[PDB]
Short mmCIF file of C-alpha atoms in Angstrom, two decimals:
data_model
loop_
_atom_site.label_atom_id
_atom_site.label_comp_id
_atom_site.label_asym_id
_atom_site.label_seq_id
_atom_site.Cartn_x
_atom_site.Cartn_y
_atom_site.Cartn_z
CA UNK A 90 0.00 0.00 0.00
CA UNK A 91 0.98 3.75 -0.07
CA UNK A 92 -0.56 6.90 0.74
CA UNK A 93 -0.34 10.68 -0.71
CA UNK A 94 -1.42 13.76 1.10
CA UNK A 95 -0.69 17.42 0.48
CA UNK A 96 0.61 19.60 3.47
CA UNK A 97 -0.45 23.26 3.60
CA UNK A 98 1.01 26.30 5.65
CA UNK A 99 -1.30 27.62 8.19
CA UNK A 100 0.12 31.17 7.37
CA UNK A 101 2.12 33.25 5.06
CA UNK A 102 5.12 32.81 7.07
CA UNK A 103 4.87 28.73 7.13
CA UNK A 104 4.66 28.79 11.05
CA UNK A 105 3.62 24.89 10.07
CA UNK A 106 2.03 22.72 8.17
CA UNK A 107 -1.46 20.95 7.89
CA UNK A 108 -2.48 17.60 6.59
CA UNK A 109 -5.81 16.19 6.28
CA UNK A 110 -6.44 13.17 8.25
CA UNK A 111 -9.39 11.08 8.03
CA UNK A 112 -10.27 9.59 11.58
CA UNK A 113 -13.26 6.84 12.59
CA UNK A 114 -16.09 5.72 10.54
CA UNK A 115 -17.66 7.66 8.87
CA UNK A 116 -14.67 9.93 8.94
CA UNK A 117 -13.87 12.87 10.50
CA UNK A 118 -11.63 14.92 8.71
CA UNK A 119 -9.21 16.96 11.07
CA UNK A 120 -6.19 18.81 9.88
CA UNK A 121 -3.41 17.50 11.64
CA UNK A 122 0.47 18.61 11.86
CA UNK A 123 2.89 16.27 11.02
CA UNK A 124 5.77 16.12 13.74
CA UNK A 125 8.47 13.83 12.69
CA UNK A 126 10.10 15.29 16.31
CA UNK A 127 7.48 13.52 18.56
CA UNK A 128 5.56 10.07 18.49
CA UNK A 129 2.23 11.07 19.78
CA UNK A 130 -1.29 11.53 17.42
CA UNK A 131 -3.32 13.57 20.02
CA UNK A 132 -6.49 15.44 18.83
CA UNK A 133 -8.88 17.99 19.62
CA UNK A 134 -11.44 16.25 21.10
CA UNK A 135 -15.35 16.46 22.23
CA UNK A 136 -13.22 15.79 25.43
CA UNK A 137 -11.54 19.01 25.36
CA UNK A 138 -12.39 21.04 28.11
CA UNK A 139 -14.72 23.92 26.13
CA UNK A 140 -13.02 27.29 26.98
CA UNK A 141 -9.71 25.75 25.54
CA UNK A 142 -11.06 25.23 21.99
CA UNK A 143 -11.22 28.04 19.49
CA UNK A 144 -12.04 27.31 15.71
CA UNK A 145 -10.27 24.13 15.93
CA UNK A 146 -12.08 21.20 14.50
CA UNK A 147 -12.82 18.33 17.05
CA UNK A 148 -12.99 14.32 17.17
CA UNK A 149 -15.94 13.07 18.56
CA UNK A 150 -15.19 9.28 18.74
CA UNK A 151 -18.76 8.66 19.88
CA UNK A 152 -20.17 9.15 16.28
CA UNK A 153 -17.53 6.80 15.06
CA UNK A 154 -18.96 3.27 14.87
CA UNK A 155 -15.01 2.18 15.08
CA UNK A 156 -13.92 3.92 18.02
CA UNK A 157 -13.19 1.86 21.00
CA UNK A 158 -11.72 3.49 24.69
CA UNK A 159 -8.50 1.91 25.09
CA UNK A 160 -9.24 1.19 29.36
CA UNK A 161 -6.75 2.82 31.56
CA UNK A 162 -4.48 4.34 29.04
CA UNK A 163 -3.47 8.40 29.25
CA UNK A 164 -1.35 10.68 27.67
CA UNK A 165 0.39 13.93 28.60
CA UNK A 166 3.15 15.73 26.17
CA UNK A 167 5.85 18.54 26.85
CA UNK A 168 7.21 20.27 23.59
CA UNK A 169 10.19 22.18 23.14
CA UNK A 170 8.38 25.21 22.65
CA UNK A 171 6.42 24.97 26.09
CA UNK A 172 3.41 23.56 25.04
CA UNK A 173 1.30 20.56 26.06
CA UNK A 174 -1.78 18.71 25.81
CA UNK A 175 -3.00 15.70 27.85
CA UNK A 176 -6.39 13.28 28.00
CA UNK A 177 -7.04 9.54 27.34
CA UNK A 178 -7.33 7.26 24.38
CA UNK A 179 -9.37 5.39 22.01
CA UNK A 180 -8.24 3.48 19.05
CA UNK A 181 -9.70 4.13 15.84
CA UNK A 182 -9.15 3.48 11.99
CA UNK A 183 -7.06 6.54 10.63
CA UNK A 184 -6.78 7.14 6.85
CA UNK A 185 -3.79 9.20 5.22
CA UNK A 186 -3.56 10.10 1.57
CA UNK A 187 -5.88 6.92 1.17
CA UNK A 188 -3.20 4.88 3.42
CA UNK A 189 -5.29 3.23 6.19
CA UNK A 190 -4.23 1.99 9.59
CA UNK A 191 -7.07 0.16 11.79
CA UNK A 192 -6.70 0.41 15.72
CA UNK A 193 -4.17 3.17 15.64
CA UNK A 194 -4.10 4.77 19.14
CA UNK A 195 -5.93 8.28 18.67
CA UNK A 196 -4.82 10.30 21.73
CA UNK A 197 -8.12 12.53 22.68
CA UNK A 198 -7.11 15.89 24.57
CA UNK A 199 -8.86 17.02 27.26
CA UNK A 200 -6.20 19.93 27.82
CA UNK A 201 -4.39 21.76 25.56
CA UNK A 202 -1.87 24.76 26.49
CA UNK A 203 -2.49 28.46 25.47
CA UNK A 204 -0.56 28.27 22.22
CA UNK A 205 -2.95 24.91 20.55
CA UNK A 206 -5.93 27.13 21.95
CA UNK A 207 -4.79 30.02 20.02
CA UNK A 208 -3.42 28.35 16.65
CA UNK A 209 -7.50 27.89 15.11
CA UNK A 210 -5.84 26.26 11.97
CA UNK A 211 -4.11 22.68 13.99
CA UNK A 212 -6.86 20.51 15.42
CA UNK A 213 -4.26 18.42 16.70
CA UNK A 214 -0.45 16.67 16.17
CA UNK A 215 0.61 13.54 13.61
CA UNK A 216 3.40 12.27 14.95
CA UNK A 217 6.37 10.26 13.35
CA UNK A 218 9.51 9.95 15.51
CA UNK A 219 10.18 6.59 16.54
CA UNK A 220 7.38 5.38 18.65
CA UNK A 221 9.75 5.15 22.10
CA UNK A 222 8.79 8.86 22.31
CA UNK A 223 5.30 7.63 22.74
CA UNK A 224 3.69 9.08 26.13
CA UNK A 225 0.62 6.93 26.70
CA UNK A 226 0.70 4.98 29.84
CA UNK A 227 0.75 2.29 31.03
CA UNK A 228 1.04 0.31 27.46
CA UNK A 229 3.19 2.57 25.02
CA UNK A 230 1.41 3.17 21.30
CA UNK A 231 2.69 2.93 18.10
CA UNK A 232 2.49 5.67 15.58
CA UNK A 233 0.76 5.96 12.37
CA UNK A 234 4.10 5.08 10.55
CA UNK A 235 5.06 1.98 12.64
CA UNK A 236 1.20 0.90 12.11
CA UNK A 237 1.20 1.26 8.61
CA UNK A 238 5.14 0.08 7.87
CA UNK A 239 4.25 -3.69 7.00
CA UNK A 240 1.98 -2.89 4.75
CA UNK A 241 3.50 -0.29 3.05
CA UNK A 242 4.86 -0.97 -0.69
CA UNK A 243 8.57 0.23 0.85
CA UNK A 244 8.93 1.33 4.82
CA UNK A 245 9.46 4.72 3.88
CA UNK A 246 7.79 8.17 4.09
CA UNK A 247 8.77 11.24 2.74
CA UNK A 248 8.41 15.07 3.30
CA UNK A 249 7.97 17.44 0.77
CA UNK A 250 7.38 21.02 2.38
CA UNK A 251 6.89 23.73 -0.10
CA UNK A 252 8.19 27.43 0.64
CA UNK A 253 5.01 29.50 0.77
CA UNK A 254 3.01 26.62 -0.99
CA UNK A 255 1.57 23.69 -0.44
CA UNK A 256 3.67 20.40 -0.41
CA UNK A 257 3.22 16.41 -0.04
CA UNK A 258 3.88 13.78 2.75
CA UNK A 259 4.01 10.15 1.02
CA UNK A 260 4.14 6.77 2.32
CA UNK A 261 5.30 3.92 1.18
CA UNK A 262 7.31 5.42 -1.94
CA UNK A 263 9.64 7.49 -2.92
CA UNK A 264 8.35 9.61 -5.91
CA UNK A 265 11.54 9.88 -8.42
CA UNK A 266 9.62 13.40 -10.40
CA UNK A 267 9.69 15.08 -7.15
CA UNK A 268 13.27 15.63 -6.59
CA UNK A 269 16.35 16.86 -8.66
CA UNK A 270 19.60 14.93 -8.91
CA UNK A 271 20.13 11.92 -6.95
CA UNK A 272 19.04 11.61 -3.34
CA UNK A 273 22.50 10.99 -0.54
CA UNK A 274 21.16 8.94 2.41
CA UNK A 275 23.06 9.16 6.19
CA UNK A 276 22.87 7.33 8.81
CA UNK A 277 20.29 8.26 11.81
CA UNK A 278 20.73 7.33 15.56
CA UNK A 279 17.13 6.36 17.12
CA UNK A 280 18.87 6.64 20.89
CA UNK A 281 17.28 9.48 21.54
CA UNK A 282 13.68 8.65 19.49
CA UNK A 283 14.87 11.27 17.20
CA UNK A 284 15.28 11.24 13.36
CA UNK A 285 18.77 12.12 14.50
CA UNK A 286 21.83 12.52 11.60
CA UNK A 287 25.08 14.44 11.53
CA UNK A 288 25.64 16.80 9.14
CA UNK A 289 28.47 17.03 7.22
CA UNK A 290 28.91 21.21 7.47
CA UNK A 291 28.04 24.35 6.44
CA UNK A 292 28.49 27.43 4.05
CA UNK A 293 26.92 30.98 4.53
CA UNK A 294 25.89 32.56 1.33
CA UNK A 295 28.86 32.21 -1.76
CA UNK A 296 31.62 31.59 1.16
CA UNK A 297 33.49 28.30 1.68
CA UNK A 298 31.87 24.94 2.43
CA UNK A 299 32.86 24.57 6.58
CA UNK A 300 33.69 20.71 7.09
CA UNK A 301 32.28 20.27 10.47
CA UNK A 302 30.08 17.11 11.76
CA UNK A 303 26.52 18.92 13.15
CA UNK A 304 24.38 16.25 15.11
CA UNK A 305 20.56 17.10 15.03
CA UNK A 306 17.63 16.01 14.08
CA UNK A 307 14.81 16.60 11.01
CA UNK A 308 11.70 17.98 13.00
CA UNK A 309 8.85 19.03 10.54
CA UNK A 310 7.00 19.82 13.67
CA UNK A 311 9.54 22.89 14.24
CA UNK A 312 9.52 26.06 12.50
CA UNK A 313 13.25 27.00 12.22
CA UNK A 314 16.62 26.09 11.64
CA UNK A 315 18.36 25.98 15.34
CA UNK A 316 22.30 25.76 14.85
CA UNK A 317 25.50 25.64 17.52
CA UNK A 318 25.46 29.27 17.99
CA UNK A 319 28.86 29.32 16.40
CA UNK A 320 26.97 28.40 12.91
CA UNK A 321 24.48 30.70 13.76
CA UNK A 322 26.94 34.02 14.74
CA UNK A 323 28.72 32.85 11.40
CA UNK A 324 25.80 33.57 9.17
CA UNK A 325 23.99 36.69 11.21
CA UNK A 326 27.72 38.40 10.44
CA UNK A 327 26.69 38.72 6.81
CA UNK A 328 23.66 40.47 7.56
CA UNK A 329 24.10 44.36 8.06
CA UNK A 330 22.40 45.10 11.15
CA UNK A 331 21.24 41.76 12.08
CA UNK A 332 21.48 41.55 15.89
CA UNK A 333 20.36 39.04 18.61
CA UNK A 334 18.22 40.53 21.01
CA UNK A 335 17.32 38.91 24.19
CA UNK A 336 13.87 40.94 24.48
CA UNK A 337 12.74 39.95 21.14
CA UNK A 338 14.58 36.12 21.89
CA UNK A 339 16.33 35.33 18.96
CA UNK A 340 18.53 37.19 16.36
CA UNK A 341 16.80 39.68 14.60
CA UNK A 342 17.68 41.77 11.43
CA UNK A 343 16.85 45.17 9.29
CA UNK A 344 13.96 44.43 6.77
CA UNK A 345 15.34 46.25 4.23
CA UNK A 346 17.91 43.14 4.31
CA UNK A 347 18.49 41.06 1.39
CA UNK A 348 19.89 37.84 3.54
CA UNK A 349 22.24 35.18 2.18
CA UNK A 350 21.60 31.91 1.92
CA UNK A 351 22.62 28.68 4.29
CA UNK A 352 24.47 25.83 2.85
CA UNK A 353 24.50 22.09 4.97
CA UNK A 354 26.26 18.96 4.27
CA UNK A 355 24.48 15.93 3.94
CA UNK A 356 27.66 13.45 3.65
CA UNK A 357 29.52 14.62 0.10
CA UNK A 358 26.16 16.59 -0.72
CA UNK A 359 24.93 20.02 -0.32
CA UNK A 360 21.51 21.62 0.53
CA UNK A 361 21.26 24.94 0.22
CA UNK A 362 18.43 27.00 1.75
CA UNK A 363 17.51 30.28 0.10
CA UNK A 364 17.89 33.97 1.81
CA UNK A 365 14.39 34.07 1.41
CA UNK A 366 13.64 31.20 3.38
CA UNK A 367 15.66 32.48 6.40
CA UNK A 368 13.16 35.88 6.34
CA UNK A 369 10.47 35.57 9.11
CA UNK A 370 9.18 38.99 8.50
CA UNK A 371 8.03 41.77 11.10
CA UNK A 372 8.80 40.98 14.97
CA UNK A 373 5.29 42.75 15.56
CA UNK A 374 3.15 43.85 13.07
CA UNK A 375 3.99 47.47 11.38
CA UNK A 376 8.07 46.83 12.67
CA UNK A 377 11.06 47.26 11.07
CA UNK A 378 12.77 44.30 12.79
CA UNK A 379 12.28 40.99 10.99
CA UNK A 380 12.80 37.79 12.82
CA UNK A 381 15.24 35.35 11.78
CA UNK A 382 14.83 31.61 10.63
CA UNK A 383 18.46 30.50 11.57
CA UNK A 384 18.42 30.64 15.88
CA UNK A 385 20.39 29.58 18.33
CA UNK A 386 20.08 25.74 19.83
CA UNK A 387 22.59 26.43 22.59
CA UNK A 388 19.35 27.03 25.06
CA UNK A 389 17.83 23.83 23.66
CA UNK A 390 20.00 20.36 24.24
CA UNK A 391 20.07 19.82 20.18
CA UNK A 392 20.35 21.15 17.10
CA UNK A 393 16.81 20.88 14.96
CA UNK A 394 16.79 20.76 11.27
CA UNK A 395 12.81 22.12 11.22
CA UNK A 396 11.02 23.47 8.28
CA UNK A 397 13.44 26.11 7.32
CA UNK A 398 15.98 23.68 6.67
CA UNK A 399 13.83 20.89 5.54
CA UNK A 400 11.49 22.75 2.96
CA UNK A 401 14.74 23.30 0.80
CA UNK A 402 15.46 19.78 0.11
CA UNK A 403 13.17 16.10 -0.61
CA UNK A 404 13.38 13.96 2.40
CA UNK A 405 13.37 10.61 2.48
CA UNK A 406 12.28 9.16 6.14
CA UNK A 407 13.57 5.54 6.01
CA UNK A 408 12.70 3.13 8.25
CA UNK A 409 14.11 -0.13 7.41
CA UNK A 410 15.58 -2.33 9.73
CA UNK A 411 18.18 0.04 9.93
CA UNK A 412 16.90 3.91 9.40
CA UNK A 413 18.39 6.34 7.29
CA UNK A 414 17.59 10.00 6.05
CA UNK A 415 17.71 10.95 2.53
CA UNK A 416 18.13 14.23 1.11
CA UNK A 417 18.01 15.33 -2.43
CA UNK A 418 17.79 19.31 -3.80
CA UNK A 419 14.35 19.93 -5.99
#
């Protein structure tokens, strides 16, 4: 089998992304974001307590003829931005792209932080790191991906973000039109649950290639490109004016700019990001100070490849036996 779904950004600054997801019988179609940093498929929910649900677009799993409670079982999630949801469980049959999984754990909030409250345009999280980052308790799920895997034509998905357009998320193939070139695969480490991979180095706009090993991971779920703040004082240098500013929390730069573009290594390969891709826009609305998509990870514990780095390239989640990540230029 294999599935096909287009991914949409919920703004003109692709903040994220949002895939439709067809959950229970007959289905509900929610509009899900698709984390390959975290292992959990929570949802707004009928559960969710009422005052924290604005716009989104709920799961009611008693008007699904498939749902089922999974007894017992709960859920509670941290991410690295803050937020965090919580509730219970029910399994469910989930379709994506016309790829469908039967009894795949379907995490129903009954909390959500601030931030999901306020973002009308998720109704709730896809996730597809390795399913040890799984939070129910006491019996750990499976994601989507590990559900699907046997049946999938090759155990593979793929991301395809598009810079201020839509894109596609595929399973179970790798599409050979949708890429340029050949694709160079690395190796990941799942010791941490991450789609983690080293990087090979870096080069800030036309300057020379840095041969440096970068651990990190590819998180679609994040917005920017967080760097050893080495990397990241590198490239700001190149900017006239670009500054970090601990009020705003980040480096921030004129926009009048015209910013360079980031180069990383992917073994022998290159992926290069365009200036325009690093360009976050207005730090409030009306401002002169535009927010930048390369950031600091020294506050974080890791560096994250998120959609900055990862719209610029076709990437090939493998999940053989032995994972890899693919990256080819398109």
């Amino acid at each position: 089998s294999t599935g096909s779904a287009t991914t949409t950004p919920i703004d003109s600054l692709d903040d994220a992304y949002i895939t439709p997801v067809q959950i229970g019988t007959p289905a509900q179609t929610l509009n899900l974001d698709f984390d390959t940093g975290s292992s959990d498929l929570w949802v707004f929910s009928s559960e969710t307590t009422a005052s924290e649900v604005d716009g989104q677009t709920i799961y009611t799993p008693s008007k699904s003829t498939t749902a089922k409670l999974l007894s017992g079982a709960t859920w509670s999630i941290s991410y690295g931005d803050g937020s965090s949801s919580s509730g219970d469980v029910y399994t469910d049959t989930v379709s994506v792209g016309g790829l469908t999984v039967t009894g795949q754990a379907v995490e129903s909030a009954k909390k959500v932080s601030s931030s999901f409250t306020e973002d009308s345009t998720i109704d709730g999280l896809l996730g597809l790191a390795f399913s040890t980052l799984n939070t129910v308790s006491p019996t750990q799920q499976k994601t989507f991906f590990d559900n699907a895997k046997a049946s999938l034509d090759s155990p593979v998905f793929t991301a395809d973000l598009g810079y201020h357009a839509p894109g596609t998320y595929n399973f179970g193939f790798i599409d050979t039109t949708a890429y340029t070139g050949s694709i160079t695969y690395t190796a990941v480490s799942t010791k941490q649950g991450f789609w983690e991979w080293t990087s090979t180095g870096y080069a800030v706009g036309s300057g020379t290639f840095k041969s440096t090993s970068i651990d990190g991971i590819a998180d679609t779920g994040t917005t920017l490109l967080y760097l050893p703040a080495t990397v990241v004082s590198a490239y700001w240098a190149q900017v006239s004016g670009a500054k970090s500013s601990s009020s705003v929390g980040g480096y921030v730069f004129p926009c009048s700019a015209t910013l360079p573009s980031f180069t990383f290594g992917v073994g022998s390969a290159r992926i290069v990001i365009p200036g325009d891709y690093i360009d976050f826009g207005p730090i409030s609305t009306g401002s002169s100070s535009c927010f930048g998509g390369i950031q600091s990870s020294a506050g974080i514990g890791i560096n994250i490849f998120g959609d900055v780095a990862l719209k610029a390239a076709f990437v090939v989640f493998n999940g053989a036996t032995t994972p890899t990540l693919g990256f080819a230029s398109k």
